[PDB]
Protein backbone atom coordinates (compact mmCIF):
# COMPACT_ATOMS: atom_id res chain seq x y z
CA UNK A 1 0.00 0.00 0.00
CA UNK A 2 0.94 3.51 -0.57
CA UNK A 3 2.92 5.79 2.25
CA UNK A 4 4.56 8.80 2.21
CA UNK A 5 6.46 10.36 5.04
CA UNK A 6 7.98 13.53 5.09
CA UNK A 7 11.26 14.44 7.59
CA UNK A 8 12.54 17.57 7.60
CA UNK A 9 14.45 20.41 10.51
CA UNK A 10 11.60 22.09 11.78
CA UNK A 11 13.54 25.46 12.62
CA UNK A 12 16.14 26.38 9.94
CA UNK A 13 17.36 29.94 9.81
CA UNK A 14 17.15 32.75 7.14
CA UNK A 15 19.59 32.59 4.62
CA UNK A 16 20.61 28.53 5.40
CA UNK A 17 19.38 25.52 3.83
CA UNK A 18 16.24 23.17 4.09
CA UNK A 19 16.69 20.03 2.86
CA UNK A 20 13.54 17.99 3.24
CA UNK A 21 12.76 14.29 3.03
CA UNK A 22 9.95 12.09 1.15
CA UNK A 23 10.42 8.56 2.00
CA UNK A 24 7.58 6.22 0.05
CA UNK A 25 5.97 2.86 0.65
CA UNK A 26 4.46 0.71 -1.90
CA UNK A 27 5.46 1.86 -5.19
CA UNK A 28 8.22 2.54 -7.46
CA UNK A 29 9.16 5.92 -7.99
CA UNK A 30 9.71 5.33 -11.45
CA UNK A 31 6.05 4.34 -12.77
CA UNK A 32 4.85 7.75 -10.38
CA UNK A 33 5.24 11.01 -10.35
CA UNK A 34 5.98 12.79 -6.85
CA UNK A 35 5.19 16.55 -6.30
CA UNK A 36 5.68 19.43 -3.29
CA UNK A 37 3.12 21.26 -2.00
CA UNK A 38 3.34 23.77 1.08
CA UNK A 39 0.94 25.41 2.86
CA UNK A 40 1.67 28.58 5.27
CA UNK A 41 0.34 28.88 8.58
CA UNK A 42 -3.59 29.57 7.81
CA UNK A 43 -3.61 29.95 4.20
CA UNK A 44 -3.94 28.40 1.05
CA UNK A 45 -1.72 25.69 -0.93
CA UNK A 46 0.91 26.31 -3.07
CA UNK A 47 2.32 23.80 -5.23
CA UNK A 48 5.97 23.69 -5.47
CA UNK A 49 7.39 21.48 -7.75
CA UNK A 50 6.99 17.46 -9.37
CA UNK A 51 9.51 15.20 -10.20
CA UNK A 52 8.34 12.86 -13.16
CA UNK A 53 9.06 9.53 -13.45
CA UNK A 54 11.52 9.84 -16.47
CA UNK A 55 13.37 12.13 -13.96
CA UNK A 56 12.13 15.73 -15.42
CA UNK A 57 11.55 18.42 -12.91
CA UNK A 58 9.32 21.42 -13.01
CA UNK A 59 8.92 24.11 -10.49
CA UNK A 60 6.62 26.33 -9.60
CA UNK A 61 7.62 30.52 -11.32
CA UNK A 62 7.77 31.77 -7.55
CA UNK A 63 10.83 30.24 -6.39
CA UNK A 64 12.21 29.90 -9.95
CA UNK A 65 15.85 29.02 -8.87
CA UNK A 66 15.98 28.52 -4.84
CA UNK A 67 13.80 25.07 -5.00
CA UNK A 68 15.52 21.69 -6.49
CA UNK A 69 13.95 18.20 -6.24
CA UNK A 70 15.53 14.84 -6.20
CA UNK A 71 15.34 11.74 -5.61
CA UNK A 72 17.69 8.22 -4.64
CA UNK A 73 14.97 5.13 -6.10
CA UNK A 74 17.39 2.65 -4.03
CA UNK A 75 16.84 4.71 -0.80
CA UNK A 76 13.04 5.28 -1.98
CA UNK A 77 13.38 8.92 -1.57
CA UNK A 78 12.63 12.38 -2.23
CA UNK A 79 14.10 15.40 -1.47
CA UNK A 80 12.99 18.90 -1.60
CA UNK A 81 16.36 21.48 -1.44
CA UNK A 82 15.62 25.39 -0.59
CA UNK A 83 18.09 28.19 -0.71
CA UNK A 84 18.12 31.77 0.29
CA UNK A 85 15.42 31.26 2.65
CA UNK A 86 12.41 33.86 3.76
CA UNK A 87 9.93 33.94 6.23
CA UNK A 88 7.66 33.13 4.07
CA UNK A 89 8.84 29.44 3.33
CA UNK A 90 7.14 28.92 7.09
CA UNK A 91 5.04 26.52 6.10
CA UNK A 92 3.97 22.61 6.51
CA UNK A 93 5.48 20.62 3.59
CA UNK A 94 3.96 17.90 1.79
CA UNK A 95 4.81 15.58 -0.77
CA UNK A 96 2.26 13.83 -2.70
CA UNK A 97 2.04 10.81 -5.48
CA UNK A 98 0.86 11.85 -8.59
CA UNK A 99 0.06 10.27 -11.78
CA UNK A 100 -0.10 12.14 -15.32
CA UNK A 101 -4.31 12.59 -15.00
CA UNK A 102 -5.93 9.89 -13.18
CA UNK A 103 -6.43 7.92 -9.80
CA UNK A 104 -3.42 7.75 -7.24
CA UNK A 105 -3.03 11.33 -5.67
CA UNK A 106 -2.15 10.55 -2.48
CA UNK A 107 -0.71 13.28 0.03
CA UNK A 108 1.53 12.53 2.92
CA UNK A 109 1.01 14.19 6.39
CA UNK A 110 3.09 16.77 5.71
CA UNK A 111 5.94 18.42 7.91
CA UNK A 112 6.08 21.73 9.90
CA UNK A 113 9.09 24.05 8.91
CA UNK A 114 9.59 27.89 10.15
CA UNK A 115 12.12 29.83 9.04
CA UNK A 116 13.45 32.16 12.06
CA UNK A 117 16.12 33.22 13.65
CA UNK A 118 14.57 32.99 17.00
CA UNK A 119 16.47 29.81 19.24
CA UNK A 120 14.13 26.75 19.55
CA UNK A 121 13.18 26.36 23.19
CA UNK A 122 11.32 23.74 24.80
CA UNK A 123 8.12 24.17 26.96
CA UNK A 124 7.02 24.12 30.31
CA UNK A 125 3.88 21.88 30.81
CA UNK A 126 1.55 22.77 34.10
CA UNK A 127 -1.46 20.87 35.49
CA UNK A 128 -4.91 22.73 35.19
CA UNK A 129 -6.45 20.63 38.51
CA UNK A 130 -9.68 21.86 39.71
CA UNK A 131 -10.51 24.58 42.47
CA UNK A 132 -10.51 21.55 44.93
CA UNK A 133 -13.77 22.50 46.53
CA UNK A 134 -15.68 25.22 44.42
CA UNK A 135 -17.49 23.07 42.14
CA UNK A 136 -18.63 19.26 42.51
CA UNK A 137 -20.94 17.58 39.22
CA UNK A 138 -21.36 14.78 37.05
CA UNK A 139 -18.50 16.32 34.80
CA UNK A 140 -14.80 17.53 35.55
CA UNK A 141 -12.21 19.23 33.29
CA UNK A 142 -9.19 19.39 33.91
CA UNK A 143 -6.10 21.09 31.39
CA UNK A 144 -2.63 21.40 30.39
CA UNK A 145 -0.68 24.25 29.85
CA UNK A 146 2.35 24.24 27.64
CA UNK A 147 4.01 27.68 27.36
CA UNK A 148 7.06 29.15 26.30
CA UNK A 149 8.27 27.15 23.58
CA UNK A 150 8.92 27.40 19.92
CA UNK A 151 8.71 26.07 17.35
CA UNK A 152 5.65 24.69 16.52
CA UNK A 153 4.11 22.17 16.55
CA UNK A 154 3.59 20.67 20.29
CA UNK A 155 1.13 17.33 20.68
CA UNK A 156 -0.82 16.90 23.30
CA UNK A 157 -2.81 13.63 23.95
CA UNK A 158 -4.46 12.45 27.48
CA UNK A 159 -3.35 8.92 29.10
CA UNK A 160 -0.92 8.32 25.89
CA UNK A 161 -4.23 8.86 23.74
CA UNK A 162 -6.70 6.02 25.60
CA UNK A 163 -8.50 9.40 26.73
CA UNK A 164 -9.34 11.19 23.18
CA UNK A 165 -13.01 11.45 23.70
CA UNK A 166 -13.75 15.27 25.27
CA UNK A 167 -10.52 16.81 24.34
CA UNK A 168 -9.94 20.16 23.43
CA UNK A 169 -6.43 21.06 22.48
CA UNK A 170 -6.37 24.83 21.64
CA UNK A 171 -4.23 26.12 19.01
CA UNK A 172 -1.31 27.73 19.55
CA UNK A 173 -0.55 31.68 20.31
CA UNK A 174 2.30 33.08 19.47
CA UNK A 175 3.39 35.61 23.13
CA UNK A 176 6.63 37.48 22.11
CA UNK A 177 8.46 34.83 20.53
CA UNK A 178 7.39 32.44 22.31
CA UNK A 179 4.37 30.15 21.91
CA UNK A 180 1.43 29.19 23.99
CA UNK A 181 -0.96 26.40 24.50
CA UNK A 182 -3.71 24.58 26.27
CA UNK A 183 -5.54 21.68 26.28
CA UNK A 184 -8.91 20.72 28.30
CA UNK A 185 -10.02 17.60 28.73
CA UNK A 186 -13.40 17.00 30.24
CA UNK A 187 -14.44 13.27 31.95
CA UNK A 188 -16.47 11.69 34.84
CA UNK A 189 -16.15 12.62 38.64
CA UNK A 190 -16.50 8.62 38.95
CA UNK A 191 -12.90 8.65 37.25
CA UNK A 192 -10.85 11.51 38.57
CA UNK A 193 -9.38 11.30 40.79
CA UNK A 194 -9.90 7.66 41.45
CA UNK A 195 -8.24 6.54 38.43
CA UNK A 196 -5.76 8.62 36.85
CA UNK A 197 -5.16 11.64 34.19
CA UNK A 198 -1.45 12.60 32.78
CA UNK A 199 -1.58 14.93 29.39
CA UNK A 200 1.64 13.60 27.22
CA UNK A 201 3.17 16.95 25.46
CA UNK A 202 5.98 16.44 22.77
CA UNK A 203 8.04 18.72 21.64
CA UNK A 204 9.73 17.25 18.24
CA UNK A 205 11.85 20.42 17.40
CA UNK A 206 13.37 19.87 21.07
CA UNK A 207 13.70 16.50 20.94
CA UNK A 208 11.66 16.55 24.29
CA UNK A 209 8.48 15.12 25.94
CA UNK A 210 7.18 16.10 29.30
CA UNK A 211 4.29 13.68 31.33
CA UNK A 212 2.52 15.27 33.83
CA UNK A 213 -0.29 13.79 36.17
CA UNK A 214 -3.21 16.05 37.33
CA UNK A 215 -3.48 16.06 40.61
CA UNK A 216 -5.72 17.15 43.34
CA UNK A 217 -5.12 20.90 43.84
CA UNK B 1 0.33 32.27 -15.42
CA UNK B 2 -3.12 30.72 -14.34
CA UNK B 3 -4.76 32.14 -11.53
CA UNK B 4 -7.92 30.27 -10.27
CA UNK B 5 -10.01 32.32 -8.14
CA UNK B 6 -12.74 30.36 -6.28
CA UNK B 7 -15.91 31.35 -4.68
CA UNK B 8 -17.81 31.84 -1.85
CA UNK B 9 -15.27 32.34 0.67
CA UNK B 10 -16.56 30.70 3.26
CA UNK B 11 -20.22 28.95 3.41
CA UNK B 12 -22.46 27.88 6.23
CA UNK B 13 -25.31 25.55 6.12
CA UNK B 14 -27.44 23.21 7.99
CA UNK B 15 -26.98 19.08 7.76
CA UNK B 16 -28.91 17.75 4.50
CA UNK B 17 -28.89 20.67 2.37
CA UNK B 18 -26.94 21.17 -0.53
CA UNK B 19 -24.58 23.61 -1.49
CA UNK B 20 -22.14 25.02 -4.31
CA UNK B 21 -18.71 26.82 -5.27
CA UNK B 22 -17.31 28.27 -8.33
CA UNK B 23 -13.68 27.64 -9.04
CA UNK B 24 -13.00 30.44 -12.60
CA UNK B 25 -9.49 30.08 -14.17
CA UNK B 26 -7.66 32.69 -15.92
CA UNK B 27 -7.87 31.12 -19.02
CA UNK B 28 -9.41 27.86 -20.73
CA UNK B 29 -8.25 24.75 -18.75
CA UNK B 30 -9.41 22.47 -21.61
CA UNK B 31 -7.01 20.97 -23.65
CA UNK B 32 -8.17 19.71 -27.58
CA UNK B 33 -5.73 17.38 -27.62
CA UNK B 34 -6.95 14.58 -24.55
CA UNK B 35 -10.32 16.76 -24.89
CA UNK B 36 -10.30 16.65 -21.27
CA UNK B 37 -9.82 19.59 -18.81
CA UNK B 38 -7.69 19.69 -16.49
CA UNK B 39 -9.29 20.35 -12.81
CA UNK B 40 -9.53 18.51 -9.59
CA UNK B 41 -11.14 19.55 -6.16
CA UNK B 42 -9.44 18.64 -2.99
CA UNK B 43 -10.88 18.52 0.48
CA UNK B 44 -9.46 19.46 3.79
CA UNK B 45 -10.77 18.43 7.33
CA UNK B 46 -9.77 20.44 10.09
CA UNK B 47 -6.37 19.16 11.08
CA UNK B 48 -5.56 16.37 8.40
CA UNK B 49 -3.89 17.03 4.91
CA UNK B 50 -5.92 17.41 1.79
CA UNK B 51 -7.52 14.50 -0.40
CA UNK B 52 -8.49 14.71 -4.00
CA UNK B 53 -12.31 14.59 -4.81
CA UNK B 54 -12.37 14.75 -8.07
CA UNK B 55 -10.52 14.71 -11.19
CA UNK B 56 -10.77 15.97 -14.81
CA UNK B 57 -13.72 18.71 -13.80
CA UNK B 58 -15.97 15.80 -13.02
CA UNK B 59 -14.91 12.18 -12.30
CA UNK B 60 -15.42 11.19 -8.79
CA UNK B 61 -11.90 9.71 -6.99
CA UNK B 62 -11.64 5.79 -5.99
CA UNK B 63 -14.30 5.98 -2.61
CA UNK B 64 -15.34 9.61 -2.96
CA UNK B 65 -19.38 9.70 -2.09
CA UNK B 66 -22.23 10.53 -4.60
CA UNK B 67 -23.33 13.53 -3.43
CA UNK B 68 -20.52 15.36 -4.48
CA UNK B 69 -20.47 16.67 -8.11
CA UNK B 70 -18.07 18.57 -10.70
CA UNK B 71 -18.89 20.31 -13.50
CA UNK B 72 -18.13 22.57 -16.09
CA UNK B 73 -15.32 23.17 -18.95
CA UNK B 74 -13.15 25.65 -20.34
CA UNK B 75 -12.94 28.06 -17.61
CA UNK B 76 -16.01 27.66 -15.17
CA UNK B 77 -16.85 24.77 -12.68
CA UNK B 78 -18.46 24.16 -9.98
CA UNK B 79 -18.69 21.71 -7.06
CA UNK B 80 -21.49 20.48 -5.51
CA UNK B 81 -22.35 18.23 -2.52
CA UNK B 82 -26.33 16.93 -2.77
CA UNK B 83 -26.90 16.77 1.19
CA UNK B 84 -24.14 18.37 3.12
CA UNK B 85 -23.31 15.83 5.96
CA UNK B 86 -21.30 16.89 9.46
CA UNK B 87 -17.89 14.93 8.23
CA UNK B 88 -18.22 17.25 5.22
CA UNK B 89 -16.97 20.20 7.31
CA UNK B 90 -13.52 21.64 6.02
CA UNK B 91 -12.24 23.59 3.47
CA UNK B 92 -12.17 22.98 -0.19
CA UNK B 93 -9.84 23.97 -3.06
CA UNK B 94 -9.75 23.33 -6.91
CA UNK B 95 -6.38 22.86 -8.71
CA UNK B 96 -5.40 23.50 -12.25
CA UNK B 97 -3.08 21.03 -14.02
CA UNK B 98 -2.90 22.48 -17.53
CA UNK B 99 0.00 24.62 -16.56
CA UNK B 100 2.61 24.56 -13.74
CA UNK B 101 -0.43 23.56 -10.91
CA UNK B 102 -2.18 26.49 -9.20
CA UNK B 103 -4.34 26.14 -6.27
CA UNK B 104 -7.70 28.22 -5.41
CA UNK B 105 -7.91 30.49 -2.58
CA UNK B 106 -10.46 27.81 -0.92
CA UNK B 107 -13.87 27.58 -0.16
CA UNK B 108 -14.71 26.79 4.07
CA UNK B 109 -17.78 25.21 4.77
CA UNK B 110 -19.14 24.98 7.65
CA UNK B 111 -22.07 23.55 9.59
CA UNK B 112 -25.31 25.70 11.26
CA UNK B 113 -26.55 24.12 14.28
CA UNK B 114 -28.67 25.75 17.48
CA UNK B 115 -27.46 27.74 20.00
CA UNK B 116 -25.62 26.56 22.37
CA UNK B 117 -23.96 27.68 26.06
CA UNK B 118 -19.97 27.50 26.90
CA UNK B 119 -19.18 25.24 29.57
CA UNK B 120 -16.92 27.20 31.62
CA UNK B 121 -13.89 26.34 33.76
CA UNK B 122 -11.74 28.86 35.46
CA UNK B 123 -8.07 27.68 36.30
CA UNK B 124 -5.79 29.73 38.74
CA UNK B 125 -2.07 29.59 38.41
CA UNK B 126 -0.11 25.86 39.25
CA UNK B 127 1.76 25.81 41.96
CA UNK B 128 4.79 25.16 39.83
CA UNK B 129 4.23 27.96 37.46
CA UNK B 130 4.62 30.20 40.47
CA UNK B 131 8.06 29.10 41.44
CA UNK B 132 8.92 30.08 38.00
CA UNK B 133 7.74 34.20 38.35
CA UNK B 134 5.36 33.29 36.06
CA UNK B 135 0.84 33.35 37.01
CA UNK B 136 -1.48 32.53 34.33
CA UNK B 137 -5.23 31.90 34.82
CA UNK B 138 -6.76 29.69 32.32
CA UNK B 139 -10.21 29.70 31.45
CA UNK B 140 -12.13 27.10 29.23
CA UNK B 141 -15.53 27.85 27.34
CA UNK B 142 -16.34 24.45 25.72
CA UNK B 143 -19.12 23.30 23.16
CA UNK B 144 -20.85 26.28 22.36
CA UNK B 145 -22.32 27.96 19.20
CA UNK B 146 -22.45 30.11 17.53
CA UNK B 147 -18.57 31.11 17.44
CA UNK B 148 -18.52 34.74 18.28
CA UNK B 149 -18.58 34.89 21.74
CA UNK B 150 -17.26 37.38 23.89
CA UNK B 151 -14.71 36.81 27.20
CA UNK B 152 -13.99 39.82 30.06
CA UNK B 153 -11.65 39.07 32.69
CA UNK B 154 -12.06 41.14 35.84
CA UNK B 155 -9.14 40.85 38.68
CA UNK B 156 -10.51 42.23 42.42
CA UNK B 157 -14.07 43.24 40.07
CA UNK B 158 -12.02 45.62 37.37
CA UNK B 159 -12.02 44.69 33.82
CA UNK B 160 -8.36 43.84 32.67
CA UNK B 161 -7.24 43.95 29.22
CA UNK B 162 -3.38 43.21 29.07
CA UNK B 163 -2.26 39.96 29.51
CA UNK B 164 -5.26 37.98 27.52
CA UNK B 165 -4.38 35.42 24.53
CA UNK B 166 -7.59 33.73 22.89
CA UNK B 167 -8.08 30.15 20.62
CA UNK B 168 -10.39 28.99 18.89
CA UNK B 169 -10.89 25.58 18.46
CA UNK B 170 -11.92 24.61 14.67
CA UNK B 171 -15.64 23.58 14.14
CA UNK B 172 -16.39 20.40 15.92
CA UNK B 173 -17.59 18.21 13.26
CA UNK B 174 -19.93 15.96 16.01
CA UNK B 175 -21.57 18.76 17.40
CA UNK B 176 -20.90 21.75 14.83
CA UNK B 177 -19.88 23.98 18.12
CA UNK B 178 -16.83 25.50 18.98
CA UNK B 179 -14.45 25.75 22.28
CA UNK B 180 -11.95 28.33 23.04
CA UNK B 181 -9.40 28.98 25.83
CA UNK B 182 -8.93 32.46 27.36
CA UNK B 183 -5.83 32.97 28.85
CA UNK B 184 -4.54 36.07 31.45
CA UNK B 185 -1.10 36.03 31.76
CA UNK B 186 0.49 37.96 35.01
CA UNK B 187 3.48 37.81 36.90
CA UNK B 188 3.88 36.05 40.07
CA UNK B 189 4.13 39.94 41.64
CA UNK B 190 0.96 41.37 40.29
CA UNK B 191 -0.88 38.06 41.05
CA UNK B 192 -0.65 37.75 44.44
CA UNK B 193 -1.45 41.77 44.82
CA UNK B 194 -5.00 41.11 44.47
CA UNK B 195 -7.85 38.84 45.11
CA UNK B 196 -10.57 38.20 43.09
CA UNK B 197 -10.20 36.73 39.69
CA UNK B 198 -12.72 36.26 37.15
CA UNK B 199 -13.40 34.94 33.94
CA UNK B 200 -16.78 36.40 32.22
CA UNK B 201 -18.37 34.47 28.60
CA UNK B 202 -21.28 37.27 27.80
CA UNK B 203 -22.89 35.20 24.78
CA UNK B 204 -26.03 35.54 22.47
CA UNK B 205 -27.83 32.53 23.88
CA UNK B 206 -28.13 34.12 27.35
CA UNK B 207 -29.29 37.68 28.28
CA UNK B 208 -26.78 37.27 31.39
CA UNK B 209 -23.05 35.92 30.40
CA UNK B 210 -21.75 32.87 31.85
CA UNK B 211 -19.34 33.67 34.98
CA UNK B 212 -17.00 31.69 36.94
CA UNK B 213 -14.12 32.85 39.11
CA UNK B 214 -12.13 32.40 42.47
CA UNK B 215 -10.27 34.04 45.13
CA UNK B 216 -6.67 33.04 45.84
CA UNK B 217 -7.15 33.25 49.70
ZN1 LIG C 1 9.65 13.44 -20.09
ZN1 LIG D 1 20.49 30.84 -5.56
ZN1 LIG E 1 21.45 5.46 -3.83
ZN1 LIG F 1 -16.36 19.32 21.68
ZN1 LIG G 1 -2.67 46.07 40.00
Known amino acids: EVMLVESGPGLVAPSQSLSITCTVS????????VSWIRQPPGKGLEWLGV???????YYASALKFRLTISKDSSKSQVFLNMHSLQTDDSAMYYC???????????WGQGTSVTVSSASTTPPSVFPLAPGSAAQTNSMVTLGCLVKGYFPEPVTVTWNSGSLSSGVHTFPAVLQSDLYTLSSSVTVPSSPRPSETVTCNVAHPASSTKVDKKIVPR | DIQMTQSPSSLAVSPGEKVTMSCRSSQSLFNSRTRKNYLAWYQQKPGQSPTKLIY???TRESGVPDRFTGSGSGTDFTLTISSVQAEDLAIYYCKQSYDLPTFGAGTKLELKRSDAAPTVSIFPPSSEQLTSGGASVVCFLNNFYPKDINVKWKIDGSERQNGVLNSWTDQDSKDSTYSMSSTLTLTKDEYERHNSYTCEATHKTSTSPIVKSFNRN
Open chain 2, 56 to 58: WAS
Open chain 1, 26 to 33: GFSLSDYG
Open chain 1, 96 to 106: AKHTYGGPGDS
Open chain 1, 51 to 57: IWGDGST
